[PDB]
């Protein structure tokens, strides 16, 4: 079919089926190419009777068949190059092409896309909707007024997006689509880090036995109750049926190789039951069904397909059958879905040619000499690719390619309910219902790998993938900081993002009001014995300094513990005891080696003491710490130091030295001599036998209680001085 | 021309060179045209005659001109689809091709490998050397016999690494030659670490200056005066001439647009000496010669552009109608025959493998042959086919890699004095000798910059290029630790990491301080015991007074010790020791002869509590550690010193002076007491030696604090002499 014109367009529609192996063309196509193909030549008489588009210049039409096959579209595409580039003894004079408009299947498109670029023509193919048709750097003579399939995916993720479905489970078909389909999506899905599951190349209606092993990969996670689609139709509908068969429920999202068919769920409508799907936003063409209502053999004769068509539509074998003045009516008609493309691709040519025309013919309106030859990369990249028209007779509907020549991205969201219903369209903005879903809204799928987690339970191992982080709960020892890390505080301020580990000061009324008025009682007392004025005499005041000495130190412990006061608190235990068993061992070994022994004797028991000090100093750093077993015990000191390798040592060495010389000071004395002062020095035994009974068992064994473990055993020992200081009104008045 | 035989072949050469754009054609070439048309068609008559490639079938031709030009070629390779696969239905009968040899230049062989993709049909290149066409996923069939040009790249760069060359400049051209050849170069000489200094692209048909502003920026860089070339033929022809005007000296080695031609330096061979030139390695064919010589117009009816070059080579025939013929004087083989040769008999060779396979049975066209798979007779017999080239004596096997290209055989040449010469040659490992190179021989170039970098250098500036740097030392004291830092570790390690400042040693032992200051020690101790140890018997206060000294003597041997935590602490109870004890021995002595005189212990105790209480403010204020007091230039410092700063020895040291002082002074003009001369004499000599301590302690220790050899024995002899002052006091009283 050739129609005369000045400025012919090429096509290739299938009008035939792939056939059987010689047979290349066995049954005609019936929706894709007959209504196709009239779509255009109803477009062409449009565009020709109209009088804003080309109004001078007459458009006709070279219009040849794919027959759905890449070989068969190659060789009917060369008498489009024969006429224009072919400059080499008139019947069947090829027309200068323009552009084809031809290329239904993505196959056949790339075939001729790969031929025309040679030869400078301009294609737009009208279904072709393949991904690796939009490098220019190959298919640079190329543009589509069909969205390319990878836009489905980045689609489709957006309902995962807007639904916060993130777990996900994704099965594909064996075929060209779904394979740079799902290689799209996960690439696309990743962007917000959709949670991927599992990925499954479905074969190609191989065998029933591999739908139901998807499904056994399926049902085994179940987190991910939200499984993605990119198989082709065929495919799709056996996957469900054997969804059906074992009964498995799931919440299907499928791209227009589901499409909004009821094909694709008959008998399985219960298992596919509120399955969110898309499919291209097609809207019908009303001019073009009367048009094509108006149709019949007796006035058609421009298609040679017609008489095939008529038969096949309307059976009519050899025996005619047909023979009848039967029309085609909306009885037995259907507007196929993308004759609103095809109508569109012409008009994107003839918009741009009619622009072309009036810059390089703008005097006048009919072609002008400039436009003999055809510059076919001036008329694809400066006016094909650059084009802005509303559709026609389409009252968002605005025509215009991208900079791959690929048409703009419009979707409708189509939702199982039995029946399809439209529950919102993708444009560039997923503009959905959030109602009006059936299997998505009462039973709302929420699809993740582990569940949200509660500030106790922070740390996130992810046993699965990255994206299945399971959270146990760090302990308050422990601690909870980070969803990947627990942290810790110290003392006080619980957790915010920080957990809370190990953090280390008493104000007690009785235990600590006590050492005060003990200590005030024997200064007073101290100070009334020193002052009388009536005359060993002189080391029983120094005495008496020793035990208001160890008054003091336990006035000063009455306050915050410091590292310095374990060591001060140290000299003060060892300088008390000091004190009083330097003034008992007076004025005894008088009865029973040098005369002068006094001053040695004082001498040498002073030395002892401030040896122990000296090395316990130098050897042991009175430091401060605070003892406590668990992390969230009070953050407050315990113990300065040790207290058992030094301060157990040396307490017990201060004691032992003190109590044998209080035993044997009254044991083998042989002094009758004032037999007060034995009595006395012996009863003074039991004043420092208190002490270690009360400091032992205060810190050895259950010192847990160091509110009154250690502030208990302070005051043990300190009312020992009492004793002999009023024993001097009986001698005197 | 078409000649009919039972696979006929498609023929594309460059007949007509591109003469206007009036003209279709234009004029007809010479050397890449009727040279290598000729050369197929002379291998066609050899596989025909030949009787072990292709003996059952009769191999046709069907040649075609490309003029030069895509567009042209398009339309010309066009008849060859209309025959094999558009069998869709007298004048002008086509028949069925088993592919091309064809595609000369690199544009021509990409649009006509581009369409006769589509049919599935291969396609042998014998010329076009691009780089762009050995991706298979535009053009998988598509073979070469010839190598891409950025095997090139390769070869030129492994010569720069063999000479130790790494500081290189660059030229490129503009169009697709040298833009995508230097853009090969780049990512090789990276592989073996090879830098660039400039990289400069040269317009094609541009004024002189452009080219005299290369020039100028390639003398920018004096550390690199190998460079890399990769225009063509004529931009490299007179680049050299501004290279003359200029007179730079430079040696240049540079790609097959300079080639082995004495028109390149043509009228500047002076400049460009030792230039170091790739060229594609093609023997000659000597049976081509022989039958080019035998070609006229007579016996070549099969050529019909044979006649119109008849006419154009000898300008005839037209008005000289003559008898000439051809011959070695006006004739020389076209590099690229060898190539042309190899093409044909690589599609022979794969035609008639494939052919031992389908027709196994017969030796001719069998049924299975009706019809050729041009994928099975790619993939599966065109790139997997092996066989040493005809008419050439051997390594000269003709096979495809992966992408269908010819293996890289590249000769080395070289300018000498002025002629061309094969120094080596790049197969496939660099094998070239340097001793007979024109400036290898006189100064062997080496262009490299400051890479020989000592460790003492170890500091890199990096002023300009990357690759570039300067080498210079950091700080000997301070930290060294690479070329791009210089980090500290401390004065206890070594300088290469480089050491600042740390903990260190902090001894004061010393040769002459060993034996001296141990005995000093000892001896006044000695002294002190003898002097106390008697057994005839106030010699109670004196004997604490001695106490109290010894004491301080104890410190000043102990202070030669290692230091510690505590050392500060005991040095400051040492010095307030001896003075509290030497001073409250005093006091007893004076209140003894001069509110009762019965309060001596507490006087003597209340002065240690004091200097305890000043020293537990001192502690307080600062633990008596260690200082490691470091200010020179001395590389960290000696850990021999004080918590604190010499504050507690000039403050602390001052409040117990100025307690001596007072003394001093009291019992001088404060004394009233004339009698009690042995006293007065001994009160006297304490006054005496306190100010004499004074003067000679607090400048003599306020000056050495840095030198440990004045500071060391700035405090120990301070108040060593006075305990020796005061030792001999006690005997004047005895006899
Ligand atoms: N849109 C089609 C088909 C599209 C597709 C695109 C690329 C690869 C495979 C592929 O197969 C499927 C399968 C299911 C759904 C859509 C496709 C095109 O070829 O572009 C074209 C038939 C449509 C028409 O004639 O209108
Ligand atoms: N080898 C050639 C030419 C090659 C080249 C390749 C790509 C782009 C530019 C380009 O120009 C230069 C310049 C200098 C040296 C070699 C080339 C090819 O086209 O491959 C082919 C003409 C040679 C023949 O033998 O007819």
């Known amino acids: 079919i050739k129609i005369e014109g000045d400025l012919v367009l090429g096509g290739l529609f299938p009008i035939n089926e792939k056939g059987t192996g010689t047979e290349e063309c066995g049954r005609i196509n019936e929706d894709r190419g007959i209504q196709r193909l009239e779509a255009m030549l109803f477009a062409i008489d449009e565009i020709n009777k109209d009088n804003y588009l080309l109004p001078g210049v007459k458009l006709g039409v070279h219009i040849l068949d794919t027959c759905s096959r890449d070989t068969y579209a190659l060789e009917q595409s060369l008498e489009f190059v024969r006429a224009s580039l072919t400059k080499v003894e008139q019947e069947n004079i090829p027309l200068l092409i323009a552009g084809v408009i031809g290329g239904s299947y993505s196959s056949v498109s790339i075939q001729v896309a790969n031929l025309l670029r040679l030869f400078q023509i301009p294609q737009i193919s009208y279904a072709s909707t393949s991904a690796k048709l939009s490098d220019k750097s190959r298919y640079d003579y190329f543009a589509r007024t069909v969205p390319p399939d990878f ?60 739908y139901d092993s998807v499904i056994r990969e399926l049902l085994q996670k179940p987190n991910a109750r939200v499984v993605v ?4 139709s065929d495919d799709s ?15 299907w999202v499928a791209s227009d190789g589901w499409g909004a068919q009821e094909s694709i769920v008959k008998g399985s409508e219960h298992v596919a039951y509120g399955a969110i799907t898309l499919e291209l936003a097609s809207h019908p063409v009303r001019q073009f069904d009367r048009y094509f209502q108006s149709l019949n053999p007796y006035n058609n004769h421009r298609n040679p397909w017609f008489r095939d068509f008529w038969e096949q539509k309307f059976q009519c074998s050899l025996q005619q059958v047909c023979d009848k003045h039967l029309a085609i009516d909306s009885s037995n008609y259907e507007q196929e879905s993308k004759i609103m493309f095809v109508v569109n691709a012409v008009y994107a040519m003839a918009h741009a040619l009619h622009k072309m025309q009036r810059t390089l013919c ?24 650059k084009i802005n028209f ?23 969201v189509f939702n199982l309910q039995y029946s399809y219903l439209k529950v919102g369209h993708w444009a560039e903005t997923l503009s959905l219902d959030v109602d009006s879903i059936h299997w998505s809204r009462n039973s709302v799928p929420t699809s993740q790998c582990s569940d949200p987690c509660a500030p106790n339970e922070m740390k996130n191992m992810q046993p699965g993938d990255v994206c299945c982080w399971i959270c146990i709960p760090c302990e308050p020892y422990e601690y909870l900081v980070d969803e990947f890390t627990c942290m810790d505080c110290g003392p006080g301020q619980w957790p915010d993002l920080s957990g809370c580990y190990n953090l280390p000061y008493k104000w007690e009324d009785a235990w600590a009001i006590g050492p005060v008025t003990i200590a005030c009682l024997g200064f007073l007392c101290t100070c009334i014995v020193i002052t ?57 070994n008088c009865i029973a080696i040098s005369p002068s022994s006094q001053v040695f004797i004082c001498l040498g028991l002073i030395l002892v003491q401030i040896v122990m000090v000296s090395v316990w100093l130098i050897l042991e750093t009175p430091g401060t710490r605070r003892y406590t077993l668990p992390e969230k015990r009070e953050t407050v000191i315990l113990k300065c130091n040790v207290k058992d390798s030094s301060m157990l040592i040396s307490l017990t060495y201060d004691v032992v030295l003190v109590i044998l010389c209080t035993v044997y000071a009254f044991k083998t004395r042989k002094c009758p001599e004032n037999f007060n002062e034995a009595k006395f020095i012996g009863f003074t035994m039991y004043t420092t036998c208190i002490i270690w009974l009360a400091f032992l068992p205060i810190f050895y064994v259950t010192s847990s209680d160091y509110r009154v473990q250690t502030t208990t055993m302070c005051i043990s020992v300190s009312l020992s001085g009492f004793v002999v200081l009023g024993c001097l009104f009986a001698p005197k008045v």
């Open 151 to 210: 836009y489905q995916a980045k689609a489709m993720a957006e309902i995962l997006r807007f639904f916060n479905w993130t777990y996900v489970s994704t099965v594909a078909s064996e075929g060209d689509y779904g394979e740079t389909g799902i290689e799209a999506f996960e690439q696309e899905a990743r962007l917000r880090n959709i949670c991927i599951a599992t990925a499954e190349k479905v074969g190609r209606s191989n065998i029933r036995k591999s």
């Open 229 to 232: 689609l990119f198989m082709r």
């Open 237 to 251: 509908r056996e996957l469900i049926a054997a969804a059906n068969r074992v009964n498995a429920s799931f919440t």
């Open 362 to 385: 703008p005097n006048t309106t009919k072609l002008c000499d400039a436009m003999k030859i055809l510059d076919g990369k001036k008329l694809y990249k400066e006016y094909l690719l």
């Open 390 to 412: 509303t559709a026609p007779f389409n009252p968002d509907s605005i025509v215009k390619f991208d900079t791959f020549g690929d048409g703009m991205g419009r979707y409708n």
């Open 532 to 588: 009388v004025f009536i005359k060993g005499r002189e080391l029983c005041y120094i005495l008496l300094f020793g035990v208001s000495l160890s008054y003091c130190m336990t006035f000063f412990f009455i306050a915050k513990p410091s590292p310095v006061i374990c060591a001060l608190r140290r000299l003060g235990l060892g300088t008390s005891f000091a004190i009083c068993y330097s003034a008992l061992l007076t004025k005894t």
